[PDB]
Ligand binder design. Structure first.
Ligand SMILES: C[C@H](O)[C@@H](N)C(=O)O
Ligand SMILES: C[C@H](O)[C@@H](N)C(=O)O
Lengths: 410, 410
């Protein structure tokens, strides 16, 4: 029917479905959404423009849109224990931009986690609007432990006097002490924003402490560990802040929201409020720990910080291949996607890096367990140690295909 | 059976589908997308992170995503005749922000169409990031003709000396001369950006002159007259601006793109390349002109500029009801949604306005013709003359149901 009209597009979508089936996805930001989240996004709510907020719309015909957006807001509030939520940001970048716009002025100093240790692009990369508009100053982990050192972060905050401190990371494997971050913010009179995008599903699942009681404002993506549609979310307990956030999102940065994506956010948040989501989060944690253990045991690989207590970890591969870029290329030859990744105090260039980052959420959402996870990391050790032996990669490829065959994506 | 898990969300979606069926949508921005466009947005492409651009991605496993985005880009180029396209902006607001980031600096002077005569929020409203970051000075239409006066705009531009002139409007009913806008820009050394979001479908259908050969950069939404999914699009013929635009969208303003929405853009652009789309645009123009004609003939109503040559028009309602806010609330009683709208040189407050805006794209997409269009406008005239009279509104609401029943939405 509708696909006969555009075979080039619809065939490419079948190819991507098959590609996702035959791939072992370890990119730590990826997940596998439910059928219901996809269907929500494919509905006729896309036809209706909803500029404004529930009960305060520009346009009539919005009573039902209002029920759907209210459901998203109420479920975010319930799941994360916050008194206000805004479900309109189109992305995590828009969510973060709305928060800077609400709490600080162009030119103010912001402290964020060093891009080599886990900081996101929107936490002050010079190539980001973040870096261009505000004065970002980065904090790092300790050189020797590779852990956050809250005394060192406090001593830097006293020198730099930020207006806003950002906590959260895309490559930190350990539990963040949000209460200490709020104590640091308090000691220098800064706001604390936490970007929980990478860990939000473990926060919902109960496996990572919540930032919501400690941060002035919490942002997140609805995708990644929370396993929702791609989009943003902002949370706060402060009603004056909530009103600034609302105006910064619309009409400050966006026009009307994507109400079909907001319906998919409502669906994903009810999935996360279900008891099975806690089990999901336990398996994320155990799968990641099983893979990190293979690299820990092995003499030629070091895990940054020695391990993980979340969904991901970094590995210094440089004793085995030249750089993380090479490691990423080799593993792509066996149907395993991950990303090269700077390690703390990274010596090589950003385009090479000394490391890979590995995450467990996608394989976990396909039903894989600890045994599979250990096996995948054993395959990665093999392929990297044998990168210039085409015979070997070929056999690992065939092994990988038996595994993917056994854990159907959908 | 996913709906049985969340009946509250899925019941709300069935309610909006029914509400859309029973509504006569005349909000000039709205449309009714195809089933193919909705289906595309509901695919597993949401799972795949595609930071970067085709062949230049942060991550592997992206070869097929590259085919999908390349199709969108190529179809946009071909539909609009542009040498470069970027299909990743999440909205029209992010498209425009990326253009301003690429062409000018914070604090520079920008001329845009006055917000009472049709300039968009992102062309300088003080509540927008646009208005807060840049110095916007507006041009207007001539007071007597309500037409753009290109001589008067040149004289103003010579005084103001903007770095950037923005053309495009959300409420201007007549054909814009983009060649003259570019001659004005060239005469004062400004860039020209055209936001063609409202008219993009008419540009595509052949019914409105293309800005693409004249603007340095053209932005649009993919929704509205173009009848695609919600999102943005940028076009340019200058390779050096293309490069700056690409960096501005990512990583300047956004993270990774919504690839499932990009597939839906590819779908909508192929629909618009088809000969049937020219017939759609013809109907859009005739339907709008039939509804304007009812208000033109009637003595108590005045159409701004005396009529229309696009998808929309404005009506000064103030001889019949107090303000356009009242007119919007009255017509919602009879299942007709439109929006109040400032008219040029508006005397009332922006919360009330002297006018309504009416557009044809949505009713046109449901198959209505000139006879139905004229009938709907006669109903609006009756409802507004009888706004006081609940039993008249009741009768009109029954008549609207007969017509909506006869023109099924999907
Ligand atoms: C902005 C966006 O949501 C980003 N965090 C990403 O995953 O692409
Ligand atoms: C930013 C956005 O796309 C605006 N033009 C709208 O339709 O909502």
């Amino acid at each position: 029917d509708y696909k006969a009209f555009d075979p080039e597009l619809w065939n490419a979508i079948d190819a991507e479905a098959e590609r996702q089936q035959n791939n072992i996805e370890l990119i730590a930001s990826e997940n596998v959404v439910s059928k219901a989240v996809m269907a929500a996004q494919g509905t006729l709510l896309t036809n209706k423009s909803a500029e404004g907020y529930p009960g305060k719309r520009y346009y009539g015909g919005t009573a039902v849109i209002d029920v759907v957006e209210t459901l998203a807001i109420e479920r975010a509030k319930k799941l994360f224990g916050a008194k206000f939520a805004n479900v309109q940001p189109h992305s995590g970048s828009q969510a973060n931009a709305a928060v800077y716009m609400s709490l600080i002025q162009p030119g103010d100093t912001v402290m964020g986690m060093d891009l080599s240790a886990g900081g996101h692009l929107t936490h002050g990369a010079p190539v980001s609007f973040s870096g261009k508009t505000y004065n970002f100053v980065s904090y790092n982990v300790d050189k020797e432990s590779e852990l956050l050192d809250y005394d060192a972060i406090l001593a830097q905050a006293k020198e730099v006097r930020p207006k806003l401190i950002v906590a959260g990371a895309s490559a930190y494997s350990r539990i963040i002490d949000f209460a200490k971050f709020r104590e640091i913010a308090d000691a220098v009179g800064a706001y604390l924003m936490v970007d929980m995008a990478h860990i939000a599903g473990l926060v919902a699942s109960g496996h990572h402490p919540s930032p919501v009681p400690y941060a002035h404002v919490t942002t997140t993506t609805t995708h990644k560990t929370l396993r929702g549609p791609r989009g943003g979310l902002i949370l706060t307990d402060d009603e004056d802040i909530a009103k600034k956030l609302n105006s910064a999102v619309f009409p400050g940065l966006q026009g009307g929201p994507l109400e079909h994506v907001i319906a998919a956010k409502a669906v994903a948040l009810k999935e996360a409020l279900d008891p099975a989501f806690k089990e999901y989060g336990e398996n994320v944690i155990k799968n990641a720990a099983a893979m990190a253990d293979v690299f820990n045991q092995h003499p030629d690989f070091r895990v940054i910080s020695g391990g993980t207590n979340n969904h991901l970890f970094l590995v210094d591969v440089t004793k085995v291949v030249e750089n993380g870029k090479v490691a990423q290329n080799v593993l792509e030859e066996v149907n395993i996607t991950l990303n090269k990744n700077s390690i703390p105090y990274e010596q090589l260039s950003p385009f090479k890096t000394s490391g890979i980052r590995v995450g467990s959420p996608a394989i976990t959402s396909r039903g894989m367990g600890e045994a599979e996870s250990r096996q995948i990391a054993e395959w990665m050790v093999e392929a990297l140690e044998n990168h210039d032996k085409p015979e070997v990669l070929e056999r690992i490829r065939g092994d990988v295909k038996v595994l993917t065959d056994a854990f159907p994506l959908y």
